[PDB]
């Protein structure tokens, strides 16, 4: 119930599973792949907490889903074909908004990032829900404006139907000249399959990533909590490409 | 569809199991009455499981029936849940054929160490139970037949109940079940389940129940029941078939 | 040097939480036994190597063969070589480490009671070195509460040498009832690999090592500690065979 | 005791491998040049392993020979070890018959995906290497033949060295081996081994070495070498058969 109670409980949940040594091994993996998964073997939150977060997200989707179907010029015209729930609607959730600022959760994850995780991001990008449900729905190749995202894989299709996360770490976002396909020609793609209930941390500014299009009608739902690193602060947003908040963004080209 | 399911299931099993590793599962099945197929030791492709669950979700929506009763043949333990009857489930081509698959039954017989025979009373070949209210439960009981494959289609968080509790190496005397005396004499093993798990159960000699939901949640299973040779030619007794008939003779008001 | 405590403290702090030590305390009470293996280390590699080397010298210099039966434990055998506690105590490394406030302070989170390095001078330490077929540390209990056992060298499991234990027992020296206790209680068998350590509740855990099925090498170091319940206890038994092979309870064979 | 081995081995492998799981080991062998048979993937029964190890330990005590040289056909990389020659090992009836077992060779051909032919130069059929001293090593090299089954009979702890380092998808040019250049162009995969492991190695296209021992310790292997079709009627060139002839022209002193 009380926000101090979830923090107090989460602190114990993590202390039952992690040591400074094992977190340092997760930090190595995060640096190597841009990505670290918390699955059935290595949980991040109590199952009752994730259940509460999923049910709140199910409600926001029912009440506020907005279909997007566009190409984004700042990422080489890669597609966005999904429904979204905007950040300002998600922020009305006391659970999601407080958990996304938990000193316990941010303090734990900073041992994986090896730097301070700062909950000071543009108010249109604190949270995002994506809800894919039709064949060929996809979150096309892109980067993030900020350093970090904790992605909740709330509902995942069987791997045979797509929806895996593909990633190329150790890259960067040149919005004037993204060179996405030339980068794929130069770099190996790592494909990360996900199961419902998984969570994963993603270094979104230096990891080029997409979700594999759904091969048939199927449900893929995630919650993205975005955070900044120090390098993101006092840096100006550019690109006029904030399509999830504004489907009429200058860089969005509708289909 | 078609015979492609069996051919693909065979490959899926051959990628994961060997005679040596199946014999190790057989030892566990015999020690615990129970073996679990979880995220690390899967039993069916996720695509196949998904199709089964969608079939069951539809059957629940069209045919679910509430049950709220005590069964006198099991010490008046409760049954509080919704069910879908075997004869409705049987209309599913997917579930009925998979339940008779020579690939699936032949694999699982390496665990039972005896032939799994798909010839059971037509009111008990399949069952779906669907719990969703606080205190919903499948109270302590045994099964009339030797085997069940349980699909843990949807499980609540462990903190909300819904685990399977089991005491292997028991027997069901319907005139004197001795459930609470048996618990005083034997240790209880509690098995937590997660959505997507499956598990094989020795239902005739394992006393078992589902831990009641501690709050409104959702717990949904599909039960595929099979016979062993010892179950054939034997007559059903007890007038206690509460899932097919809510007013079976043994069923009592709460 | 004298920096072991600083090194050990940092080593343990990186691998344990109070919550994870509480899980070990549960296991210790339930089994009388808790094993520090590759997944749950207790000392750095450098310290293990140093302790093992010191013990390897002590064996080369002071090994003493024992082959007897002990009447206070039902005439169960002792077939092994030993190095007496007084020889081992001359090691500044082993004696210092066996009194480290970091080691004893951490392990007290497992025992859940103070660990007291106030033990009879002939039982503070023991090395046992089994080398021949049928060598065994037969069924027995300890006079004190606690032992930290260093599995310095262990044979492959197929050659024997595992620890067998039955927790929640006690040592009646006039009527040990070992075989009758085995008939009433389940035996837990614990295999060990070289470099393992384990903590043992020696006064309430009946235990033995499974005899060697063939000539092999099994070498351990025993640091024995007291609990409060042990202090000012009168040692009874005339059975301290490892310090004195002519103890009265020792029947040779 | 000679046709019994073939029969006992076939049943041992039938219980632990399916065609599908062998196909997965073939992918790894192709990709890495290397497949490990460890506790999770046994290749021979423990009794047979023990018999071979005891035989090799006798051959070592009786016939071990020190080698301490640089090999000019592999860029002067070192060979610092003891060896037992193929001629002495060949007198073992157990090792000899096992190395030609149609069961063993037939099983492993599911991993190589081609026939494994026990038709190699008599001086290379078998080899024991026995490393005992700090900086003992089998320096960077290739094999003249396609295949080797290595028995990791005794391995030091990983912290003391003795791992197998490998670069697959290479070739051995004995006039210009370009070892260090190849290391600059390619990633090195390091394979730790434990006593009791076996591993299959594609010796002609995998550049490999053993990491030098960082202190006195014991590392003992048995190499069974086989040919593939590409190797039949092979011209052996280089004057570099240092294990069999320490006065080989290509063998230099340190
Ligand atoms: N920059 C991302 C949007 C991230 C929204 C959530 N932080 C894209 O181009 O799709
Ligand atoms: N005998 C069980 C019912 C099993 C029905 C499905 N095989 C009970 O009393 O609850
Ligand atoms: N009481 C043990 C000897 C323990 C000596 C070392 N603490 C026995 O009878 O074998
Ligand atoms: N070609 C190897 C010798 C392998 C001998 C055993 N087949 C080397 O240069 O060391
Ligand atoms: Cl992003
Ligand atoms: Cl049942
Ligand atoms: Cl003792
Ligand atoms: Cl070679
Ligand atoms: V992204
Ligand atoms: V003892
Ligand atoms: V080689």
PDB file of C-alpha atoms and ligand atoms in Angstrom, chain C residues 137-138 140-142 147 149 163 198 200 202 205 207-208 222, ligand 10:
ATOM      1  CA  UNK C 137      36.328 -40.636  10.301  1.00  0.00           C
ATOM      2  CA  UNK C 138      33.662 -42.902  11.812  1.00  0.00           C
ATOM      3  CA  UNK C 140      30.721 -39.370  16.039  1.00  0.00           C
ATOM      4  CA  UNK C 141      29.749 -36.048  17.548  1.00  0.00           C
ATOM      5  CA  UNK C 142      31.872 -33.204  18.852  1.00  0.00           C
ATOM      6  CA  UNK C 147      33.528 -26.570  13.587  1.00  0.00           C
ATOM      7  CA  UNK C 149      35.955 -27.558   8.194  1.00  0.00           C
ATOM      8  CA  UNK C 163      30.189 -36.188   4.929  1.00  0.00           C
ATOM      9  CA  UNK C 198      31.652 -25.955   5.608  1.00  0.00           C
ATOM     10  CA  UNK C 200      29.030 -27.876  11.200  1.00  0.00           C
ATOM     11  CA  UNK C 202      29.141 -30.762  15.921  1.00  0.00           C
ATOM     12  CA  UNK C 205      24.892 -33.534  14.432  1.00  0.00           C
ATOM     13  CA  UNK C 207      28.372 -37.405  11.435  1.00  0.00           C
ATOM     14  CA  UNK C 208      31.075 -39.423   9.674  1.00  0.00           C
ATOM     15  CA  UNK C 222      39.158 -28.372  11.556  1.00  0.00           C
TER      16      UNK C 222
HETATM   17  V1  LIG E  10      33.309 -34.428  13.710  1.00  0.00           V
END
